[PDB]
Structure formats: C-alpha cells, structure tokens
Ligand binder design. Structure first.
Ligand SMILES: NC(=O)C1=CN([C@@H]2O[C@H](COP(=O)(O)OP(=O)(O)OC[C@H]3O[C@@H](n4cnc5c(N)ncnc54)[C@H](OP(=O)(O)O)[C@@H]3O)[C@@H](O)[C@H]2O)C=CC1
Ligand SMILES: NC(=O)C1=CN([C@@H]2O[C@H](COP(=O)(O)OP(=O)(O)OC[C@H]3O[C@@H](n4cnc5c(N)ncnc54)[C@H](OP(=O)(O)O)[C@@H]3O)[C@@H](O)[C@H]2O)C=CC1
Lengths: 253, 252
C-alpha cells in the first residue's frame, strides 16, 4: 500500500496498458481517475475491477485532441476528486492515452490529417495536460509519459506515430528539469509490443512473429508494463527523473 | 517481503551504496552475502544491522582484481549459503564494489588503468560468468555504473572507461541470458553520500549538490531503492537497460 492517500489520473485507462496501470495504482491505495474517450463500458469495467479488488476509482470522459479537451477532463477529475476526498490534489499523472494502431501507415500513404490527429492526441494533449496538472500537484508528485520503443527502433509503417512519441519524450526531458525544484519527477516508460486485448493478439501466428521482437521471445502483457509504471509512481523512484525507462522485454538490444 | 526465499550477493556491501542495498534486499526477505575487501568491521556492521532488522546475512571477504578473486569469493559465498539453506542457489548478483577527485588525463598511468579495469570491469564480467552457474531462471544481475558514462569530466576518464566497459556487460549479457529469464541492467548513480569524509564538509557538499537537478547530493538509499526494485519480480520486463538513478544529473 505504497500510494495510500494519493490521487492518480491514468489517461486512456478503459483498456490495455492504461487499465492494467489503473488497476495496479489502485491496489497500492491510490484513488484513480479512469479516463477514456468513448468506450464507456470498458471504462466502467476498469472501475468495476478496482472496486471489487477493494480500491477506489471513477470514470472521466474526455476526447483528447479537440478544443476544450483538457478543460473537460479536469472538470470531471476535480468533481470526482472533491466528492471523494474534499480536495482536488493530483499526485500522479500518467499520460497513457494515444492514437495507437496495429495497422500502421506506410510513409507514402500518410495524410496531413493523420499527422495532425497523432500530434494532437499523442504530443500536444500530454503537454497541455502536464501544464494543467501541475497546478494541482504537490511537491513530490509524479508525471509518467508512456512512450514506445519505436523511438529507438526503425519501423517505417509507424513513422507518423513515432514522430509523436519523439515529441512526447522531449516533454520528459525538458519538464523534468523545469519541475525538479518542486520535487516532481517526470519520466518516460517505453513499452514494446504489448497485448492490449486487440484482435491481433487472438491470431497465434501473428503473435509468434511479434514475439520475436523481444529478447524473451514473448509479447508483453499489459501488466509487465504497468508494473514498471507503478514503481515509478512510488516514493522509491524519487531519484529517477528525466529518464527513458525501457519496459520492452529486451526489444531495444 | 518481495524477496522471501532468495539469496543475494552484493559486492562491496560493507559500506556506502552497497551497504544500503544489502540492507534493503534483506528487508525484503533475501539472505544477503555482504562482500568486502578488507574492512571486516564495516561488513560485520552491515550484517548486524540486517540481523537487528529481522533479516539474514553473512560476510564474505575477497579482494577483487587479483588472481583467485572469484574463487575466493565463491568459496565463502557457497559455504555460507549451504550452511544456511542447504543449497548454493544465487538469485541476485549486484556488481557494486569498485575503485571510485579523479586523475587528470596527463597523470593517468598504465598501472592505474590496469587497477581500475581489474576491479571495475574485468571482475564484474568474471563474477557474472561464475554466478550464472548457481542462478535459477528468473534471476537478476545488476551492474552499478555511473552517470559519468554520459557526462564529460576529464579527471574521470580512467574511471569512466571502466564503467563504459561495465555497461557493455549489461547490453550483451542481457541478450545472452534472456532465454533463462535472467535480467541484466545497469543502475547509474550520480554523486552519492557514501559516508566518506568529504560528505562531512558542508561547503564541498553544497558544490557537489549543484550537479543534481534537485540540488542535493544523493543518499545511498536513493540509489539502493532503485537497485532493490530491479531485484524484484516486477522489473521482469526491464533488461539490457540503463537506469538513471542520478537525481537528474544528466539534465545539466
Ligand atoms: N504494443 C502496445 O500495446 C504498445 C503501446 N504503447 C503505448 O502504450 C499506451 C497504451 O497503449 P495500449 O494499451 O495499446 O492502447 P489501447 O489502444 O489499447 O487503448 C487506448 C486508450 O487510449 C484512449 N484514447 C485513444 N484515443 C483517445 C483520444 N483521442 N482521447 C482520449 N482517449 C483516447 C482509449 O479510450 P477508449 O477506450 O475510449 O477508446 C483507451 O483508453 C499508448 O501510449 C501507446 O502508444 C507503446 C508501445 C507499444
Ligand atoms: N558518488 C558515488 O558514491 C558514486 C558511486 N558510484 C558507484 O557506486 C558503487 C558503490 O560506490 P560507493 O558506495 O561510493 O563505494 P565505497 O567506496 O563507499 O565502497 C566501496 C565498497 O567496495 C569494496 N571494494 C572496493 N574495492 C574493492 C576491491 N578491490 N575488491 C573488493 N571489494 C572492493 C569496499 O570494500 P571495503 O569496505 O573492504 O574497502 C566497499 O564495500 C561503485 O560501483 C561506484 O563506482 C557511481 C557514481 C557515483
């Protein structure tokens, strides 16, 4: 129970790594805001798991990458926090939500609209969420940006996505220095291929190809990544800031 | 109690980061071999702290960087593990011991280059090579590096060469040992209070503190807490990595 009395926001925690992260932060005692865009049933399933495991959570709906996104997220976040604690304190922000697609887009096919959508959700929104979140964050808080090993591993069909993770990691570098005087750490956690419950992970043949990317010759589980995020959210990571934390199962060898 | 039933060796755990590491691994339930070169009294103090906190440890003497060093260390390690467990299983190796105001490049001698590398690079490699004989699937190898591998400091060139070599053990042995589920990682401190007399001088401590983004020197426990997490099951998806435990020293 390393996060008793702490409040956390995990963006995009209806599903996948974000769900696994929300679940683990709540097991440590955090009150978790389970954010999503449209899959309300999946968000409610994250919250239901947390409640059945004895923790506390609530859903927050906000489409990122559109005007008023940060506002809408913080309206729901602060209402839920205040109703449950009397305060709006935000100890932990995990920038996990993303436009993230198995399909990819080869470079010849990328559209300007796709560049904008990826940017808006995966780079711009995290930046503006950090800027808003720090207002509510006490000295000693945690900002965790979920990147990708593809910032270090060339994959043409993910160029547009990867640009935005490269921008995200700059948030980590420069905001770690900016926020160090407040004792707020800022770190990147970089997954490799991770089973998020998508259909592709039900096709054993493709799963076996994907598994070869890891030195362990298996795809990651959501909990493999979420366990690392959870550690970073704790007090014992205090001397880690501005870092790139490889949570890829040895993909970046 | 994340390390119940596990056996750990922390090299150079009589003092400094290694002592803080041994203490924290033992709090999690590991049986800790507290290794040292010559300061038996300091080793016995680490062991006494672990026992008073309700854990298990024993001391092991071996000078590294001399003929017969790995053999001497493993003779003591395996005797102590067998007496206490009936087994010689080694779950966790932390390569922490090192030769560590530097030496200006012009003044570095061949003999100094040899001593730094014997202790700080060669011995860690040979200790990994021997340790895996004893290590179950799912084990942990943790190499203590330095942020100086990423931050130029001329008077640390000789030291830093050996940490650069140590980090290659991380990279290539992580790939080698991955089929066994053994992870291999580097943890890189910044300036860290190891109880040396320079940390008793508030004026020098204040100058050293400016290297961290937090404007304090590291405590041994700041680093040891990271090492301890890497030793646990929850780090299983981290291998071959450079883990910055420097308090933001590489931000500049
Ligand atoms: N192999 C992998 O799974 C890898 C994942 N990552 C990264 O890990 C993170 C999590 O990935 P993963 O679990 O696979 O993601 P999923 O695609 O499984 O889930 C995405 C989550 O983000 C939310 N989301 C998506 N778009 C928006 C938006 N515009 N506004 C608000 N919320 C949105 C979703 O909400 P809703 O449910 O409402 O749609 C959902 O909660 C991402 O940053 C991803 O880039 C990195 C490397 C590999
Ligand atoms: N600022 C710092 O403190 C920094 C430390 N590091 C690294 O962290 C690690 C721990 O450093 P720190 O705690 O400062 O170290 P200390 O110098 O405080 O302690 C050194 C430890 O290593 C042992 N040791 C030294 N040489 C030998 C040898 N030849 N054979 C066997 N054991 C030996 C010592 O044994 P005995 O007690 O018997 O002498 C002691 O236990 C090292 O790898 C160091 O390079 C990295 C960056 C900065």
């Amino acid at each position: 129970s390393r996060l008793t009395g702490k409040n956390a926001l995990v963006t995009g925690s209806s599903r996948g790594i974000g769900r696994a992260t929300a679940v683990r932060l709540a097991r440590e005692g955090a009150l978790v805001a389970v954010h999503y865009a449209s899959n309300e049933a999946a968000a409610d399933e994250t919250v239901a798991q947390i409640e059945r495991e004895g923790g506390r959570a609530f859903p927050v709906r906000a489409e990122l990458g559109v005007a008023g996104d940060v506002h809408e997220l913080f309206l729901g976040l602060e209402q839920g926090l205040k109703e449950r604690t009397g305060e709006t304190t935000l100890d932990i922000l995990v920038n996990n939500a993303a436009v993230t697609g198995v399909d990819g887009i080869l470079p010849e096919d990328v559209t300007a609209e796709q560049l904008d959508r990826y940017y808006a959700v995966n780079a711009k929104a995290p930046f503006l969420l950090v800027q808003r979140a720090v207002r509510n964050m006490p000295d000693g808080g945690r900002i965790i940006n979920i990147s990708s090993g593809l910032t270090r591993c060339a994959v043409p069909e993910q160029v547009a996505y990867s640009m935005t993770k490269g921008a995200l990691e700059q948030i980590t570098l420069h905001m770690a220095k900016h926020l160090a005087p407040r004792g707020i750490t800022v770190n990147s956690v970089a997954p490799g291929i991770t089973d998020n419950g998508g259909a592709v992970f039900d096709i054993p043949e493709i799963v076996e190809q994907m598994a070869q990317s890891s030195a362990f010759k298996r795809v990651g589980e959501a909990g493999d990544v979420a366990d690392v995020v959870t550690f970073i959210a704790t007090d014992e990571s205090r001397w880690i800031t501005g870092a790139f934390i490889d949570a890829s199962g040895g993909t970046l060898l």
